[PDB]
UniProtKB/Swiss-Prot annotation:
Segments on the Cytoplasmic side according to the record's topology features: 33-42, 105-124, 194-223
UniProt keyword terms in alphabetical order: Cell membrane, Disulfide bond, G-protein coupled receptor, Glycoprotein, Lipoprotein, Membrane, Palmitate, Receptor, Transducer, Transmembrane, Transmembrane helix
Source domain of life: Eukaryota
Residue window of the full protein shown: 58 to 371 of 424
Tissue expression notes: Detected in brain and small intestine.
Key word Transmembrane helix present: yes
Region of interest (Neurotensin binding), ranges: 241-264
Posttranslational mods: N-glycosylated. Palmitoylated; this is required for normal localization at membrane rafts and normal GNA11-mediated activation of down-stream signaling cascades. The palmitoylation level increases in response to neurotensin treatment.
Gene that produces this protein: Ntsr1
Any GO MF annotation of the entry: G protein-coupled neurotensin receptor activity
The protein's assembly and partners: Interacts (palmitoylated form) with GNA11.
Protein's recorded name: Neurotensin receptor type 1
Subcellular locations according to the entry: Cell membrane; Membrane raft
Main location: membrane
Family named by the database record: Belongs to the G-protein coupled receptor 1 family. Neurotensin receptor subfamily. NTSR1 sub-subfamily.
Length: 459
């Protein structure tokens, strides 16, 4: 019982996967080969790109010819027969072990942030990749001995040389070592990481309006590596099952139906193995899209603090996050208003910066503008619609801080917009009380007159 359509249909998909997957992975290697501490990401995607390319470049064509179509006459000889299964198992390992390495490094980043900043290094990562490939090569050696050509008819076929019990051990080993062991670790680590991360995400409540970039980056990383785990399982599960079923269901019991089932199941199972390889460049696009967006934001905070207006406009233009925040909860607007760079401050608000943004301490951009003393920046923030009576953890409004450093000019501009002259903090001191304590006699004189006006309004 034979049908050609299955082979033709499979061949079409095999070609579709080959052409795109080979080119995609080829470019992925070429791109990274040309072009921070997040170059460790590049090394891992380079390994997958290579391991996935070899599958499509060497395993697929040999599969498509001598396994799908032409059966009896084997055209790759004893070396090609031995080598095929070696290069296959080397890449089944290398890929499986790279997917774990990813989840181990994401876990380390979330679980041990302080440790990961010291422990993780480029030179260290390089060693890890070296080990993975060398481990995979060493673990694939058995396939050079277990597989070899035999003459059935010249009708020479690439069939195992060793016995079923011997063959059952190496395959049982391969499956656990290069799938189950990895997938358990990868899954649980990613599950623990997601749980661990969700604590940090939820912990950032009230204290900071905008959650840090790292949290948003790691939260993005979890989603991706979740897809990587689910992707790898679905692609590789059927293939491993087929291999295991082969040896365990090899009792000569199998009728003209188990053979038929295996014929199709082989095509389906292998097709998904190449799909795994063919998908890889998507994971590269997702990872780079994430790290790029993180580096933009990271740069924006530096640039906005630096006072380089040109760089800020450039970053924002590309698609950097204006409402990003550092570990403290400091948005770019905080840094600009603090350092005093009106030029930048005007841009950030134009693009859509949260003018009412509370950091860890609860200090809005207007607090930082008053504390220092930028009469220009204060006037701007209010035009956009900064809260005039916003209070921090202690309870000090901007008018407290303007008074606390005697900005007579600034004190006047708040009053115009409608600053609460009668506002007491944790220590009970009003803006006037601080003005008196400071010795800003002019400032104190104003606050007094403003409060008095409110009295007459009552009567």
């Amino acid at each position: 019982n034979t049908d050609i359509y299955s082979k033709v249909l499979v061949t079409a998909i095999y070609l579709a996967l080959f052409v795109v997957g080979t080119v995609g992975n080829g470019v992925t290697l070429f791109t990274l080969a040309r072009k921070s501490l997040q170059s460790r990401v590049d090394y891992y995607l380079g390994s997958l790109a290579l391991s996935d390319l070899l599958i499509l470049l060497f395993a697929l064509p040999v599969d498509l010819y001598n396994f799908i179509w032409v059966h009896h006459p084997w055209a790759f000889g004893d070396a090609g027969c031995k080598g095929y299964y070696f290069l296959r198992e080397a890449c089944t390992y290398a890929t499986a072990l790279n997917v774990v390495s990813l989840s181990v490094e994401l876990y380390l980043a979330i679980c041990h942030p302080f440790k990961a900043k010291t422990l993780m290094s480029r030179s260290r990562t390089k060693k890890f990749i070296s080990a993975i490939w060398l481990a995979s090569a060493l673990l694939a050696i058995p396939m050079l001995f277990t597989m070899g050509l035999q003459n059935l008819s010249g009708g020479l076929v690439c069939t195992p040389i060793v016995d079923t019990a011997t063959l059952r051990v190496v395959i049982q080993l391969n499956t656990f070592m290069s799938f189950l062991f990895p997938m358990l670790v990868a899954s649980i680590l990613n599950t623990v990481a997601a749980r661990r991360l969700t604590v940090m995400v939820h912990q950032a409540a009230f204290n900071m309006t905008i959650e840090p970039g790292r949290v948003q980056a790691l939260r993005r990383g979890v989603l991706v590596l979740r897809a990587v785990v689910i992707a790898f399982v679905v692609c590789w599960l059927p293939y491993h099952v087929r291999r295991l079923m082969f040896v365990y269901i090899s009792d000569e019991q199998w009728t003209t139906a188990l053979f038929d089932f295996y014929h199709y199941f082989y095509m389906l199972s292998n097709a998904l193995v190449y799909v795994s390889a063919a998908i890889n460049p998507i994971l590269y696009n997702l990872a780079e899209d994430l790290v790029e967006d993180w580096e933009k934001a990271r740069k924006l905070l530096e640039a906005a603090r630096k006072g380089q207006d040109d760089e800020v406009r450039i970053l924002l233009a590309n698609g950097a996050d204006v409402n990003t925040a550092d570990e403290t909860g400091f948005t770019p607007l905080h840094l600009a208003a603090w350092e005093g760079h009106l030029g930048i401050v005007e841009v950030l608000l134009k693009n859509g910066a949260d003018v009412n943004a509370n950091d860890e301490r609860g200090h809005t951009p207007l607090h930082l503008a008053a504390y220092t003393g930028h009469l220009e920046i204060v006037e701007v923030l209010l035009k956009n619609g900064a809260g005039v009576n916003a209070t921090d953890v202690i309870g000090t409004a901007p008018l407290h801080l303007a008074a606390m450093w005697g900005h007579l000019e600034i004190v006047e501009v708040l009053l115009k917009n409608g600053a609460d002259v009668n506002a007491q903090d944790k220590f009970g001191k009003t803006p006037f009380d601080l003005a008196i304590d400071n010795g800003n006699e002019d400032i104190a004189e104003v606050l007094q007159k403003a409060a008095t006006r409110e009295l007459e309004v009552l009567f």
